[PDB]
């Protein structure tokens, strides 16, 4: 998508301002996934470079 005139003054992110609940729940899910990952993903001392 090249430099087009803004679509009804929203740019390429126009639909994003039309989704309040969607955004709020998306970032709630992102925070929950990050918390359960930091409690679940595998933290090692060194990379697996053998």
């Amino acid at each position: 998508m090249q430099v087009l005139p803004p679509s009804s003054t929203g740019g390429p992110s126009r639909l994003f301002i039309m989704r309040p609940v969607a955004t709020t729940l998306l970032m709630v899910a992102i925070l929950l996934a990050g918390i359960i990952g930091y409690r679940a993903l595998p933290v090692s001392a060194l990379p697996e470079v053998d």
């Binding site: 729940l25 998306l26 709630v28």
Partner: protein, 50 residues
């Protein structure tokens, strides 16, 4: 009054049922969170998914 070197160990239904109990609560919580998120995406509202 068995000798102190006598221990016990069990297998089968007890382990399966304990694993099921451990999995059920987290499964229900994650599922309910997922439905809340998708329904909020579909309706763009707070109390409609509830």
């Amino acid at each position: 009054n068995l000798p102190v070197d006598i221990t016990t160990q069990f297998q089968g239904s007890t382990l399966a049922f304990q694993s099921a109990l451990g999995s059920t609560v987290w499964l229900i919580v994650a599922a309910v969170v997922a439905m809340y998120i998708v329904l909020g995406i579909l309706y763009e509202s707070f109390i409609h998914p509830i």
